[PDB]
Structures are given as C-alpha cells and as structure tokens.
Amino acid sequence: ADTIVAVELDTYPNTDIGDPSYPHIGIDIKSVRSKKTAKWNMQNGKVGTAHIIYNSVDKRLSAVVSYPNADSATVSYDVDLDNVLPEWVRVGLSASTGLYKETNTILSWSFTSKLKSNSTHETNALHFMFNQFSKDQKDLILQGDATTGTDGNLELTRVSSNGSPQGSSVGRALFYAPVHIWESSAVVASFEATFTFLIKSPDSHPADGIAFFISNIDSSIPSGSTGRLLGLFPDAN
Amino acid sequence: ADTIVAVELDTYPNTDIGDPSYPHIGIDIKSVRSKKTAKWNMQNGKVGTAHIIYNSVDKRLSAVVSYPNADSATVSYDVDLDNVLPEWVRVGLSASTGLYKETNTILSWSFTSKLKSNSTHETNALHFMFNQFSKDQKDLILQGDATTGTDGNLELTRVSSNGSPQGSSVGRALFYAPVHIWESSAVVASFEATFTFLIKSPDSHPADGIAFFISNIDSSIPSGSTGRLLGLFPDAN
Amino acid sequence: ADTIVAVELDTYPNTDIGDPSYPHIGIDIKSVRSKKTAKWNMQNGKVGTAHIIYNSVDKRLSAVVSYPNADSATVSYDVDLDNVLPEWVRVGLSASTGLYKETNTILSWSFTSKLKSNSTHETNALHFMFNQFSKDQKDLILQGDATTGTDGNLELTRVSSNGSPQGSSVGRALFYAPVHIWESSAVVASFEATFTFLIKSPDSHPADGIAFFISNIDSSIPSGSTGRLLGLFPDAN
C-alpha cells in the first residue's frame, strides 16, 4: 500500500471512523482517521482557499482554510515527515463522492518546496502555479475521474454535461515531476501549498471532500476508495 | 526605548548576563538575555550562513546556522510576535565589538515577508536580495560605523585600511522600506531571512557578534551599546 | 524638471499634442507626446490588466493591456533606458482627470527588478506585490489626491463619498524604496511590472488616463499637470 500524508477538507461526518459531527479540516498521517481536526464552516457554492505549510526544523504540519467575508479554520500536528515519507515524493489533490455528492472543482493550485544545504548558501527549489487548466495539461498526472479544461478548471470528480455532480466518483491530480523533500546535506527543508476550490451540491448534505496529499512517487487510487476514503486510503484503519 | 526581536550569533561569552560559556546562537525578545540558546561552533575566518523563519499560525521563531563541511546549530522559541512587535517594522543586521574584536562582514542578505488575506487568494509580499553592496546603497539605512562597498561587502563594524578589525565599534543596516507583519484581514503571515557572514579576528577571543533583528520603524542604535549589547539594547536587563 | 519614462493608458484623445483620435496605449520618453502608440479598446467599468517589460540587453520597452473575454493591445519602443534615467529611480502609478473625468482605481500592483553581475551568479533583486491597500500603507509615497484603503483599493484620483469621480484631480503612488536599475558590474538588468485597474465614468467621454512611470527618486507632481498631462509632465512639449 501507498504511504499518504494529507490535509483533508472533509464535508461529510462519518462518526464511526472518528469524524466529528460536522464538516472539518484534518491532518491525516497514514490513516483516514485524522490525527487532529478542527471545525470547518463549509459554504456550499462559494470559492474557498486552503494553505498548507511545513518545515523540517519545526516538524509541524499546519493548514488554514477560509472564504471571503468569513473567519478561518486552522489545524496543526507535530510530526517529523522524514520519518513518515520517502525522500522523493509526488504531491497531489484528491477528491471523492459516494451516495452523497458534490462538485470538487479546483480553480488554482500552487506549491513551493525548498532544500537549503550547508554549501555556500545553498538553495534548491521547485515551484509551480496553476491558475487555469487546459484540456491537455501535460504536467499533471490525472487519475480516476479527474479532468481538466472544463471552464478552464480541474474537476476532480465527475460532473454531468449539465453541471450536476455525480455520485460514486473518485479522482486525483499529481504534479508530473517527483519532489525532493529530504537530502543528506539539507540544513532546512520546507514546503508550502495553496489551492482554491468550489464545492457545490444540490443537496443539504454534500460529500465527501477534497484533500492535498503527499505520497510515494508511484501512488495510485486505492481500490474502493470512493466516498469516505477520499481517494487516499484502501480502508478505514 | 525601541522594541527589539533578534536572532544573535554571539561570539563572546558574557556569563553575568546569562550567556553560556561558549559561542552560541540565541533568540532575544526585548532583552539581551536570550530566551533560548544553543551551542555554536563558530569558525574564525570562514564564511557561514544563517537562516531565520517564522509564521503567525505556529508562532515559533526558529534559526539555523552552518558552515560548509560542518554540522549546523539550531534554536527555536515559542512567541506570538504580534504581541511583541508593532504592525509595521523595519528589518536589519547589527554587530559590535568592544575591548575584544572581530570583523563583522556581510556578504549577502535576503528577506521575504508575506501576508495572505481571506480575499480570493490573496497575496501580499515584500522580497529583497543583496549579493553585493555598493558604495552608495540607497535602499539601506546605515547606522553607526556600518559601511558598504569595500570589496563589494557590508562591513557592519569598523575595519582599518589594512583590514584589521577595530574595537569599540557598533553598526547596523536596515532595509529602507517599512515591512507589514500583521494586518487585520491576514489569515497567515510569514517571514524568512538568510544572511552570509565572515567573522575574522587576529585573536583567540573574538567579540562580540552579529544579529538579524526586527524593530520599530524608527529604531536607532542605543547609546552605549558597543560590546556585549550588540548594537541592540541600552542595558543588560 | 523631473526625468520621466512612462507607459500611458490614455483614455481621452488630445489631437493637438499628437494623440490618435481614440483611446490608446503609449510609450512616453521625457514627453507627453508619445514616441509610439497603439489603439486601445478601453471598456468603461471593467477590470483590466497592464504588463510592462524591459531588459538592458535588448533595450526595448514593451507593454500589453487586456480585459477578460477581449483581445489585447501592445506597444513597443527601442530605447536604452540607461541613457535616459539615472542609476537609482523610484517607480510609481499616476492618473488624472480634467473637465472630463473617470475613476482611476488600482486593485493590484506588482514589480520585479533584477541586476545580474559577473560575480558567481550573481543576483540582486527587488520585488513587491500589492493585492490590497490599507488606510495607512506605509510602503507607498502618496502624492496629490491619491488615497488608499477605500474598499481596500488605491484611488489615484478623487472620488466623492458616493463613488462619483471628480474632475480636476491628479494623484500618484510611488514605492517607498529607491530601485537600482543600472550598476557597473551588471551584465543584465531587467524589470517587469503589472497592475490591475478599474476605470469607470458616468460619461461617454472618460478622461484622462493612468500611467506606470519610472522617475528620479525625488519626483513630485508637476504644477498644472491635471488633465492631459497625466500627473507626469509640466507642459506638452
């Protein structure tokens, strides 16, 4: 099985796998049963923004989510990612629906990783920024039901020709290049990610959510990971 | 009196003001008596690099210092800088000598500050990078004995025409623009700084050190702040 | 008198000073009588974006302006800016109204300048990005009628309490730090600027326009530079 670290924007409360009884933001370390959660006042049909930050000095994975005109939600968890993830990873976005559903539309995604060595300075970095997505977006690896180019956006889960979200859908987008998150000479390693999203549903109960994740380079959607598993995990262990 | 937050590279142990009995890196919050220190294996005559990082989510000021071919030193301290510093600040480098002395030569200095609001994204930033310093470096405010342009470097303390460091010297360089570190709409604020330095002395006992600092916009060198006060503080309280 | 280089977004045709008979984008080198113009299909009440680029190898000042859903306009002019401007400059935005009027609202402004020397690499840079403007925006020098903070924007010219633009108005905003555009060791120097603007008028004939400019560090609004002079020039020579 893959190795996954993720920040989830979890729209549906599954209380038997430890979700709180409300939409929430969570930090997931090798399990869908988040290590830490915070209440998230999710707004159906509004564009929101998520930010994720980490560095190897402090060893704290943190995230913040907001909408215009609204207060933010934040969550943090102390974890040494070099003890969880391999030295080379891929980074991605994932989303799912089940019997309950929503659009999982990404309007923008940026990421920056840096490795500073002890050689005079000495800086190594990767940065990408998407503010549109075209039909043939060659620097993304699309998995499952994910598509690019409809209204210039990344649709992680299936949307009907009329714009209605579909149930029982899972999809992911991974950046094409592998990312180097640990190196033996690094004195500080850091990453930051931001994405803007639009979660809409005809229903009072949207599901299931969107996640930013970091994985082994060869990660793939686990079998049966629709719905509450967010396209990330094979089971709810 | 000014308000100062600083990361010190303290080359001389002054044990009556709480220094450990060795060169050390420290976090200074409104006092020269560091809140946290770590041992620093300072190398006379070699070029080193310091990194300083902070964000308003985690509220942890951290620093790392290294040389080529050597292990690093690091220090961290939990502090909410919005409860210490004003909303607008200046950022700078400071150094001093006393009866013991050293060169306090800066070869490069970079800084990045970001304020992310809840408006769609919404990013505000300041970045500067110096890898040389000319004679008339109009975007630096020089204080005390600091000069620019000798061998293209920033000499924080006085150096004789022959290159020998002088005693009883203090000097600072502040970036010309004020820096916005808090704003009411910000959902995350962060800063990072890096500088490369060359501390050389003819003597077995160099003094006194170099600091990266953040201050009120109108900060000036306190009277009598040569030597152990690092050009930062009026007394050792 | 100041030394001015500017890219004008000129909303009102003043045919006796060489304007074409339509709104236009122009390159202004020490005169309001542009060296080069292109037709600009200005849209009253819509948010547009302008981009300005230059480097010292090619010695060509270029600009592009667009709106969403519309084609762009572009203009270029061959000019060695080191023969026009001093080594240190300030950069700014300017706008005016006369007997005809418009809002001259800036929603965002970014700028990047780089000087690459022959020392190993060796990079020097300044970057700033504003996506909001607060009431007390200490890193801007405001001149004339310019204000910050109304709806989070920079209003270059006066707007009544009800939002109606006023006539006979001029205002500018300059970045606080001086900018180094030439240095003796530089092997390549470049700059890029972007700003987003909203020009609205109740009238079929808006005036007078918005400009991005580069000037001597001590530049000030010339006497009598409302209307067709764009807050930039003392006369129409």
Place this chain on the structure above:
Amino acid sequence: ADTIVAVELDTYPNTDIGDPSYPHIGIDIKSVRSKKTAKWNMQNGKVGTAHIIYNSVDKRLSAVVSYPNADSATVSYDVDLDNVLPEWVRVGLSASTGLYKETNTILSWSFTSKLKSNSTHETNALHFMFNQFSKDQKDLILQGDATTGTDGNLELTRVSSNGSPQGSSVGRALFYAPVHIWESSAVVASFEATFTFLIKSPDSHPADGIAFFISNIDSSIPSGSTGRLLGLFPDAN
C-alpha cells in the same frame, strides 16, 4: 528528427560548418549552423555563467555569458519561437567531445517559464533551481554519458576516475516535467534560464562545447552527434 532551438557555448572552431575562427556563443534554430554568433573569450578551468532570455511580445532570443573579472559576450536573434517549437517542450543542457576534449561540468541550472492570460491576472508558471545534483536526481532525465552526483555536480560528458575528460562523448540532462510555452489565452509568454559551468581541458584546443536547448518533449540524442554536433543535431545541414 527532433526540433531544436539552442544557445551554444562552442569551444572549437569548425570553419566548414560556418563557425568563426575562434570560440563563440551562437543561436541555433533547427541547425548547427548558427543564425547569429559572437566572439567568446573562453577561459579554460574557470567557472562561467550563461543567461538566456525570451518573450513572445518581442520575439527575440538573447544570451549573455561571462566570467568573474572579465567582460561579457552577448548574442541576439529575432525569431518567433511559436513558429519553430511545439506548444509543449522539454528544456535541457547538452554537451559533447570528439577527438578533441574537455570537461563539461554544470555546477548550477535554473529556469523560469511564465504564461500570463487575459483572465484576472492571470499567472501560470514553472520554476526550478539546481545548485547541487545528487547521485539519483529523479527530476532529471539523463541521456548518453551524463551523470550526476560526482562532487555534487552534473557531468554532461564522461570523465575518467582520475578527473581527465574523455573523447568521443555526448550527454544531456532534461528537466522531467514538460513545459508549456504557448497557450491560446496567453497575452505574454516568457522564459529565462541560467547555468554555471566549468570547462577544463589538459589541451590547448578544448572541444566541443555546451548548449542550453528547448526541444520536442520526446527528444533524444541523435545518432552520431558527438563532437561538432553538440548532442543536438543528426548532421551539419
């Protein structure tokens, strides 16, 4: 056959394929017979830096090469790259030796590509920066004799265990992700690249050179492209 655009640092004069009678920098558009050249005072055993710049407004490919303590060389050529290259490309470094030889050592490589659309702003970008290269550099596609990790560098051509360059060698390194250089909504597209290199030879006549190139995504070393063909072209047409 591949489609190649390159900037060559050509160390050996092959006068029957149009080289000038001295080391030179050149712009190569689909042929090893440069469209434009300039004299290059190459220094055996010294670290140099090359810069390459282009944008779609001006349609001018320019390059500058220098050493510390020395004057620069520059070359430019007017060319619309959207009429030469496909919309998606890979970017790379190439080098070769023949019966004459040199080390073709890369110490650093950076690249930035940007696509600005007419949507509010709207920015898309890719940036990478290498200041070291490890043994298993997963974000580089190595071709031919290229290796990474010896002394932390990228060795494009073969070097014996003792550090002597070998003859009859060719090697390339391409960034792993495809790069988007044209898009239908872009109003400005640009790229910039920088690399630092060390060309050393025991011989009074080093050969053959180093190039930065842009190619179809599936580009490979052409058969027989050692020596004067620089790992780029199948023949000297």
